[PDB]
Each structure stands twice: as structure tokens, then as C-alpha cells.
Amino acid sequence: IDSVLPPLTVREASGVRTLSFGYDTSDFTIINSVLSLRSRLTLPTYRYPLELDTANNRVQVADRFGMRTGTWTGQLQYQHPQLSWRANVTLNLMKVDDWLVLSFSQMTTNSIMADGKFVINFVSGLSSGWQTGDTEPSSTIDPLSTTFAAVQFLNNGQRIDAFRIMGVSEWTDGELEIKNYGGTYTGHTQVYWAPWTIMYPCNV
Amino acid sequence: KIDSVLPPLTVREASGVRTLSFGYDTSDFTIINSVLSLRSRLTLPTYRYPLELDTANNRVQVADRFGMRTGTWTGQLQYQHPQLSWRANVTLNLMKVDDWLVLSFSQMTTNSIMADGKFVINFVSGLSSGWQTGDTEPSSTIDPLSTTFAAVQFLNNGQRIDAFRIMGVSEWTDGELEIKNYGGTYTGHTQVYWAPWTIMYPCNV
Amino acid sequence: KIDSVLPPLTVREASGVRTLSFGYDTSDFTIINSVLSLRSRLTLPTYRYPLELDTANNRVQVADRFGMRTGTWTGQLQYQHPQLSWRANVTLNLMKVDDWLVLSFSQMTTNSIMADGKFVINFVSGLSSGWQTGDTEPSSTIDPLSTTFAAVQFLNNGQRIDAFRIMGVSEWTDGELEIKNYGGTYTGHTQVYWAPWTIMYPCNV
Ligand SMILES: CC(=O)N[C@H]1[C@H](O[C@@H]2[C@H](O[C@]3(C(=O)O)C[C@H](O)[C@@H](NC(C)=O)[C@H]([C@H](O)[C@H](O)CO)O3)[C@@H](O)[C@H](O[C@H]3[C@H](O)[C@@H](O)[C@H](O)O[C@@H]3CO)O[C@@H]2CO)O[C@H](CO)[C@H](O)[C@@H]1O
Ligand SMILES: CC(=O)N[C@H]1[C@H](O[C@@H]2[C@H](O[C@]3(C(=O)O)C[C@H](O)[C@@H](NC(C)=O)[C@H]([C@H](O)[C@H](O)CO)O3)[C@@H](O)[C@H](O[C@H]3[C@H](O)[C@@H](O)[C@H](O)O[C@@H]3CO)O[C@@H]2CO)O[C@H](CO)[C@H](O)[C@@H]1O
Ligand SMILES: CC(=O)N[C@H]1[C@H](O[C@@H]2[C@H](O[C@]3(C(=O)O)C[C@H](O)[C@@H](NC(C)=O)[C@H]([C@H](O)[C@H](O)CO)O3)[C@@H](O)[C@H](O[C@H]3[C@H](O)[C@@H](O)[C@H](O)O[C@@H]3CO)O[C@@H]2CO)O[C@H](CO)[C@H](O)[C@@H]1O
């Protein structure tokens, strides 16, 4: 080789011509006498609800995060020291972001006291894809949320309009507790409940 | 002449032939077309809304609009019942918060209503700028999607009677949102004063 | 002497003069300040809250606090009406869920109220550790931001009368949140028993 071009360089100090390769020190280095990249970049992974769409090399929020549906089939338990019963219900469930929504269709139940508790046992009854743990609230604050239910008290053929205030109050080993603090009331033998929804924070 | 070399450059005089080569990291680079080239150049991913890349500061973030996007719908609130139906001019405030759509009703005075009935909002037209009809479509068919109470005053021959109305988001069909009034307390009346109220439902558009 | 040269290295014997040169990929590398450098070194982006980089596992995630952040406000709930106003000592639970702020009221006994009025919460002081006054600012000026019902019992000369109160989040001004009580059912009374209730509004802080 007669002469050389950059990056290649020849330095002829002390009557001895020596060839050397020139690189950007920030970009490269020599490791085990070979040109190596300095800091090879490892691409991060993503935790749900963030996901990598490998097909289009795109990071996105999972679709299910905005909406995940399900159903719970079981017995709605009403609890009061002087009165308690079980009614067969099917409620719709929807996970919207960090919230769990419960949707009750209309229902006819036995009579209730001026106040009381409703208990939903998620230990069993959940539709496919759902685990009991998926219904656990993300806080122990009481109440997590309150809503009103519109009811009709049935007493000797007449239907009497009233309301019931409902609060999500507790979750214990898969048992969700919805307190009925009260509302308007009259003596009755049976209750007609219009549809209603209740939701609470849930980050599972 | 070039007397000697330094790494990466190496001279192996193997098989009676003094030959020069350039030593590189086998996994970082590979020669192709007789030029040093990067073995696996990394393509950086793109981002789907609400994730966005702030190119100015090279920062990935959640879009601001995702947390809050406001709007208005101007149109006629339709009340529907077989024995009574009417249209009232309203302007509703709308707000997209995350994967929820909130509807905000200001106070209103309407004609009388039956013990139960439907409210229909036609989003086909009336939305403010930036909003499309499709933007109001719920993300589920569950009925009801959400329920709330509206506080009302029934006007009947001069006296104002306080009552409530339960409202549920029940259906969306080709831009028509249906809000069912299942019932609540009631009395015979000439007109209804509605206090303000909000209702929201899941919406991932 | 060097007999031969291996790629990347190549020699061009153009006009009886052998010129040694380094062969590199035109798009992968370049020559700056007479040295091999990288053509477009890729800078990895940073992340704005609620997105965060877990450096320990090199994983991008949504911060846990985004789904749930709790707190408390201790202060005096102010009831306001031109003909009646009072202050009651309360402790409210707060929870930030995504882009929402939830306020949780436990049961309470207060003085009597008018047919309508305002509740004011002064967040300027009283917030638990980690919380700033600005953290309670709504993300919209829409009125109402949200409405809910509170179940009450009016105490009127020994008898307890069940009724409801409609509550709307209406305004936030320099740390003072205003919750309007538009009305609801009513009767003359001496004191009010309030059942627990929650109210939430959009908040992207
Ligand atoms: C409309 C009706 O039959 N009402 C009965 C009630 O019947 C049950 C069920 O109706 C509802 C209801 O309208 O109250 C529907 C609703 O989705 C359910 N609510 C929830 C939250 O899931 C409730 C609820 O589970 C119960 O009322 C609580 O006690 O029930 C009917 O759809 C169901 O109908 C079957 C018919 O009886 C049968 O002839 C037909 O072939 O098949 C359908 C099912 O596909 O029957 C349910 C029986 O419980 O029952 C209550 C007493 O439990 C009262 O008598 C209502 O008057
Ligand atoms: C206060 C009042 O005028 N009330 C009338 C009502 O007037 C309409 C509107 O008022 C409100 C209301 O307070 O009832 C405001 C509210 O934001 C609206 N609510 C919703 C959910 O959109 C309602 C609602 O649209 C109607 O009640 C439907 O019945 O209405 C007034 O702000 C508006 O005022 C105009 C004046 O009439 C006009 O002189 C002035 O120059 O401009 C203002 C602003 O454009 O008028 C509205 C329509 O009349 O109207 C109802 C009957 O529709 C009753 O008569 C109320 O008593
Ligand atoms: C005694 C009682 O339970 N009810 C009193 C009320 O007493 C206050 C407080 O109770 C509650 C209540 O249930 O009414 C609890 C509740 O969480 C509070 N609500 C909110 C939203 O913060 C309310 C609210 O502060 C008031 O109703 C406003 O008027 O209060 C009691 O737990 C508390 O108990 C203390 C003992 O009295 C004291 O001897 C002991 O040393 O410490 C405990 C705990 O600090 O007392 C509270 C006093 O206000 O008070 C109201 C009048 O303010 C009525 O008399 C209720 O009947």
C-alpha cells in the first residue's frame, strides 16, 4: 500500500511508519483488540396496559383496558339481624380503565328492613376470563362509591315509589358488601327494583 | 511504506503471505458488499393514541386530550312515550375523560311527562367542532351502561312538587343515544322543572 | 511489506499508486473529523408521568399511583346561604383514580339547611401529606361537572323524615371547591342526618 485515506492514518515518528484506524471514541472503542460499539441499546419491554404490537412495531394501550365485559351469576344476599334472604341474579360487569362497573337489571325481591346489607360472593359465579381477585377494590375507604336505586314497595297490591341509597363498603376474600344506608320507606311484603349501576375503583 | 500496524488492524504473515485485516466485533458489525455494516440496526417503535412522541423533547407521553376533551351538542332533546312526546331545545356540555363520555345537563323547563319514558339525543348533527357522531358511541351494549338520578319539580296548578327521576343510558343506534326514565316518584302535573344533572357512560373512541 | 488486504479494507491501484481505504456502509456510518463515526446515533426517549421507565427491569409502565392515590382533607365544611350559614368539622377521604378525583363523605350530623344552598370546601389548607391544593383543581369549567344524590333525614321535633339532596360540583376558585345543593325533597327541620355519599369530578393533576 503506497498511501492511505481517513479513517486510516499513517504516523512515521522515529523513522517508523505506523498504520492506525481512527474512530469516534463516543461511538466506538476497542475491546479484545476489535472495533466494538460503546453502549449497544437494549429496547425496553412493556407492562400491561402498555403493549408492543410487534407486527407494526408500535407501542399502544391494550384495547381491553378501556373495556372488558363479563357476568356474575349467583345469589344476591340480603342481610339484616331480623331478616335475611337470597335471590338469584345475573349482573353484568365491565372493567373500564381502573374502574369496575356492576350493572343490575330490573328485579323483584322479598321485603327489606329500613336499612341493611347486600353481599355478592365472587368466590364462584364469574364468567370465563374472570377471577375472583379481579373484583377487588383498589382502596379500603368507606364508602368507595354511593348510588341510588329506584324502587317500588309492594304492599297489598299497591306499588309505592321510593329510593334506596347504596354504598360500596367492603371487600373481604371475594365477598363484596353493598350497604343500604336507608332512603324513603313504607311497610311492604315485596320490592320491585328498577335497573341500576354502581362502580368502584379497581386496578386489577 | 507502512512498517507496522496497531489494532484493530493486524498483519498475519500466515502461509508465506503477509496479509492485513481489520478486526471488528462479530455481533455488532458484519461486512456485506465488502463494507463494514451494522449487524441489526434498531428500528424505534411508533406510538398509537393516547400514547404520543413529543419529538421536540424526545419524550413519550399520554396525550393531554385523553384526560379531558370538551364539547357541546346543540339540538332537540326528544321525549318519547306512546301517549305523549315532545321536543325541547337544549345545549348539553360534553366531556371525554379517559374512556368515559360525560353528558352535562343544565337546568331546564319542559312539558309534562308520563310515569316512565325515553329521552333521545340525536348526535347525527349538532356536535361542536372537533366532534364526530361516532365519538359518542358506547364501548358496550350492556343495558344499562349507567344510571343516575335527576331532581325535578312537578308543576301542578301553581304548586311545585319535589320528586326524582331515575335515568339510565340504555342504547345507541346510528348516532341516536337513548336514555330511559324507568320511573321514580310522580304526581299529575302540567310542566317539569329539571335541576342540573350529569350522566356518563363507557366510550373508547 | 503487506502483500494483500481483506474487506472492509480495499486498495485502488489507480495511476500506478495503490491507495488503502476503509470500506463502510454509506447509511450506517460516516466520517467526521477524519474518523469513523455513526450516522444518526439513536437517542432513546424519556417518559412523562403517568408513563415511567422501570430502570431495574428496563420496562416501560403506567405508574401505580395513577390508578389509585389516597388522601384526606381535614377542615370545615362550609354551608352557605344568604339567610343561613354554618361550619361543620369534617374529614373527607380523597382518591385520585386515573383522571378523576373522588370525594368520600362519611355519615354526618349538621345544623338545619335551606331548600337550596352551597357547600364549600377550602383546600388551601387541610390536605394530608403528599397533597397540594392544586391537586384538587378540576380539568374543566363546565357546570355541573358531576351531580349525585345524598340521602338525608330531617329532624323536626323528634320525628326523623327521609329525603334526598341533589349535589353538583359547580366551581373551583383558588382552592375553594363549591358543591351546589340545587334542592330535592324538603320539610321544616332543626337538624340534618346525612348518610354517607361520594362525589367525583374530572381532574388531571
Ligand atoms: C319478568 C319476570 O319473570 N319477573 C319475575 C322474575 O322472573 C325472573 C326473570 O326476570 C327478572 C325480573 O324481571 O325481575 C329479570 C332480571 O334480569 C333479573 N335481574 C337480575 C339482576 O339478573 C331478575 C332477578 O334475578 C329476579 O327477579 C330476582 O328475584 O329477574 C325472568 O327473566 C325469568 O324468566 C324465565 C321465565 O320464567 C320462563 O318462563 C322462560 O321460559 O324463561 C325465562 C328465562 O329465560 O324468570 C326469573 C325467575 O326468577 O322472578 C321474580 C321472583 O324471583 C318475580 O316473580 C318476577 O315477577
Ligand atoms: C331562564 C329561562 O329563560 N328559562 C326558560 C327557558 O329559556 C331557555 C334558556 O334557559 C334555560 C333554563 O334556565 O331553563 C338554560 C339552560 O341552559 C337550558 N338547558 C339545557 C339542558 O340546555 C334550558 C333548556 O334549553 C330549556 O329550558 C328547554 O325548555 O333553558 C335561556 O337561557 C334562553 O335565554 C335566551 C332568552 O330567551 C333571550 O331573550 C335572550 O336574548 O337570549 C337568551 C340566550 O339565548 O332561552 C331558552 C329558550 O327559551 O325556556 C323554557 C321553555 O323552553 C322555559 O320558558 C324557561 O322558563
Ligand atoms: C358522636 C357521633 O358519632 N356523632 C356525633 C358527631 O360526632 C363526631 C364524630 O362522628 C361523626 C358522625 O357520625 O356524625 C363521624 C363522621 O365521620 C364525621 N363525618 C365526616 C364526613 O367527617 C362526622 C362530622 O364530623 C359531624 O357530624 C359534623 O357535625 O362526625 C365522632 O366520631 C367524634 O367522636 C369523638 C368523641 O366525641 C370524643 O369524645 C373522642 O375523644 O374522640 C372521638 C373521635 O375524635 O366526635 C365528632 C364530634 O363532632 O358530632 C355531631 C355534631 O358535630 C353530632 O353530635 C353527632 O351525633
Numbering used by the authors:
A (entry chain C): 266 to 469
B (entry chain B), C (entry chain A): 265 to 469
Question: Can you provide the manuscript's text about this entry?
Answer:
To visualize interactions between T1L σ1 and its coreceptor, we determined the crystal structure of the σ1long construct in complex with the GM2 glycan. The crystallized T1L σ1 protein folds into three β-spiral repeats and a globular C-terminal head domain. The map has interpretable electron density for all four sugar moieties of GM2, including the unique features of Neu5Ac, in all three T1L σ1 monomers. The three copies of the glycan are crystallographically independent but nevertheless make nearly identical contacts with their respective binding pockets, providing additional support for the validity of the observed interactions. The GM2 glycan binds to the upper region of the T1L σ1 head and thus not near the β-spiral region as predicted earlier. The Neu5Ac residue contributes the majority of the contacts between GM2 and T1L σ1 and is wedged into a shallow groove bordered on each side by β-strands B and C. Additional contacts involve the GalNAc moiety. The lactose component, which forms the backbone of the branched glycan and would be linked to the ceramide anchor in the GM2 ganglioside, points away from the protein. The N-acetyl and glycerol chains of Neu5Ac insert between β-strands B and C, where they form hydrogen bonds with backbone atoms of both β-strands. Additionally, the methyl group of the Neu5Ac N-acetyl chain inserts into a hydrophobic pocket flanked by V354, F369, and M372, consistent with the dominance of this group in the STD NMR spectrum. The GalNAc moiety does not form any hydrogen bonds with T1L σ1, but it clearly interacts with the protein through van der Waals contacts.
The σ1 protein mediates the attachment of the virus to target cells. It is a 150 kDa homotrimeric protein that assembles into a long fiber that protrudes from the virion surface. The σ1 protein can be partitioned into three functionally and structurally distinct domains: the tail, body, and head. The head binds with high affinity to junctional adhesion molecule-A (JAM-A), which serves as a receptor for all known reovirus serotypes.
